[PDB]
Design a protein around this ligand. Structure first.
Ligand SMILES: Cc1ccc(S[C@@H]2O[C@H](CO)[C@H](O)[C@H](n3cc(-c4c(F)c(F)c(N=[N+]=[N-])c(F)c4F)nn3)[C@H]2O)cc1
Length: 138
């Protein structure tokens, strides 16, 4: 298994048609997962499944610029299940990151950070056993 938190370099940043695939298993009593697409210290796209936010499950997405979080985009559709294997696919499209979980579309996140070629790291953190993290062009 891979170490968590995991640092996946994205050489030269991201580009439309780049597909990132994360495979893992959610831990028993998981609390949180995070994917952090980073441009240096900024987080261009934070994808944060929360398993117990006021006793509800929700996905919070946001961007961090100069150490400040912006406006959250929340998705109450929650495809993750504690204890179970998952696949997250993040497809970079021209105007947004497109996320599918277990082969079902989940959400799109419009690019706030526009220098895609500078979004050169993906951090994977939280309450998972991480099996694989990779990218390819489609
Ligand atoms: C005015 C105001 C602004 C923000 C807040 S809350 C803030 O909200 C933003 C999204 O808007 C982010 O979710 C922030 N976050 C999450 C994590 C994180 C982590 F640190 C971990 F270590 C994780 N896993 N492991 N281990 C893991 F999954 C994580 F998500 N880091 N930062 C969160 O603090 C409250 C009030």
């Amino acid at each position: 298994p891979l170490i968590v938190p995991y640092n996946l370099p994205l050489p030269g940043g991201v580009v439309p048609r780049m597909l990132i695939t994360i495979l893992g298993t959610v831990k028993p009593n998981a609390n949180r997962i995070a994917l952090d697409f980073q441009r240096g210290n900024d987080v261009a796209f934070h994808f944060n499944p929360r398993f117990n936010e006021n006793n509800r499950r929700v996905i919070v997405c946001n961007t961090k610029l100069d150490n400040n979080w912006g406006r959250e985009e929340r998705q109450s559709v929650f495809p993750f299940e504690s204890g179970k294997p998952f696949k997250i696919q993040v497809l970079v499209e021209p105007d947004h990151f497109k996320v599918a979980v277990n082969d079902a579309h989940l959400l799109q996140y419009n690019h706030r950070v526009k220098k895609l070629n500078e979004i050169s790291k993906l951090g994977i953190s939280g309450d998972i056993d991480l099996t694989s993290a990779s990218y390819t062009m489609i």
